[PDB]
Write a protein that binds this ligand. Structure first.
Ligand code: CA
Length: 368
């Protein structure tokens, strides 16, 4: 296998989804902070360059009508990654793409909380991407965790799937966002919620013909500031283990994450239009939208009737290893620290990546 960048339109072939329907019958949401004006121009460049029909989009001011929904310049790279990776992974079509924009002038984290709340209250998007997060202990200390978990609980009960990036700091989420900290490990919010699917990161190798070859843990070591870039993974210190995770024996009574993983290494990342220029980007910010687009295909294959899938993933995959690419090599720390990948579920990558046609067949036979 070779490590190289990929057009998001390649993710269906890589994850065995070409034979599934597109997500043309499923509405997808993206949570953003601030506006998406440049992102929508970059999305038009993406669909037009790839010869695809245009995507129907809507933007939603989730807070005060007088709030600040101006574009955040750095934010546009995130919304570009999320929207292009979803539409590519979805097979080039989604019913509608809804951007739930957080007010930037709201106090604390309340703008973001209100963006989650609007997506759940409206209950129009079946699958919602969240390529964001921060140390769960900080979210817990100011009340954000508690408030937002209520919203995600409502989402799961009404059959919506939030997909949340597990983090880019490996095990060192709470150490100044990714500075090595020896044996002290931590995880990201809202990925640690049991009411969302947490998505970690791989290094993706493809064959000379573009087919899947293998995946290892995403860990690209330290940047020039000394910050680690690697997949978030571990367990929450606050959230109890939901019972479907009992199949991973020998783990604490806490929510273990991530659940599944997809491509995240910048060196094997996605080629994304950002302010008109193509850039090769990674992060678990990539992995989550890949899952969102693929999962929205399976919703369209099933009349949008698949409920929150965490318990089903754990029962199906633990009993049916052919549904995943099991990542077995690498670690998500530094200097000998961190968790190691291995057979079956592991802390860097969870169950690994989904083989979508095999999972679709499983759902046809068994339901989900
Ligand atoms: Ca594994």
């Amino acid at each position: 296998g070779t490590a190289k960048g990929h057009n998001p339109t390649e993710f269906p072939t890589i994850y065995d989804a070409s034979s599934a329907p597109t997500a043309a019958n499923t509405t997808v949401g993206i949570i953003t902070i601030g506006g998406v004006s440049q992102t929508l121009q970059d999305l038009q460049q993406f669909t037009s360059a790839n010869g695809l029909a245009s995507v129907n989009t809507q933007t939603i001011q989730t807070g005060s009508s007088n709030g600040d929904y101006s574009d955040d310049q750095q934010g546009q790279g995130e919304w570009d990654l999320d929207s292009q990776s979803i539409v590519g992974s979805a097979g080039g079509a989604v019913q509608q793409l809804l951007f739930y924009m957080a007010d930037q002038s709201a106090s604390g984290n309340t703008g973001l909380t209100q963006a989650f709340n609007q997506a759940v209250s409206d209950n129009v998007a079946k699958v919602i991407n969240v390529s964001l997060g921060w140390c769960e202990a900080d979210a817990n200390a100011d009340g954000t965790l508690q408030a937002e978990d209520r919203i995600f609980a409502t989402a799961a009960a009404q059959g919506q799937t939030f997909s949340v990036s597990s983090g880019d700091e490996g095990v060192y989420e709470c150490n100044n966002r990714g500075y090595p900290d020896g044996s002290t490990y931590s995880v990201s919010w809202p990925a640690s919620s049991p009411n969302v699917i947490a998505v970690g990161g791989t290094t993706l190798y493809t064959t000379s013909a573009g087919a899947y070859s293998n995946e290892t843990v995403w860990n690209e070591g330290l940047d020039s500031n000394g910050k680690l870039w690697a997949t978030g993974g571990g367990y929450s210190v606050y959230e109890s283990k939901p019972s479907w995770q009992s199949v991973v024996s020998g783990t604490p009574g806490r929510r273990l994450l991530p659940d599944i993983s997809f491509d995240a290494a910048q060196g094997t990342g996605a080629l994304i239009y950002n302010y008109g220029q193509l850039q090769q980007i990674g992060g678990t910010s990539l992995a989550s939208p890949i899952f969102v687009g693929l999962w929205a295909r399976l919703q369209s294959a099933n009349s949008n009737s698949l409920g929150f899938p965490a318990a089903s993933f754990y029962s199906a995959i633990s009993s049916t290893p052919s549904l995943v690419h099991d990542v077995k090599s690498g670690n998500n720390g530094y200097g000998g620290y961190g968790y190691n990948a291995g057979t079956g579920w592991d802390y860097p990558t969870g169950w690994g990546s989904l083989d979508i046609a095999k999972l679709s067949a499983y759902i046809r036979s068994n339901g989900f």
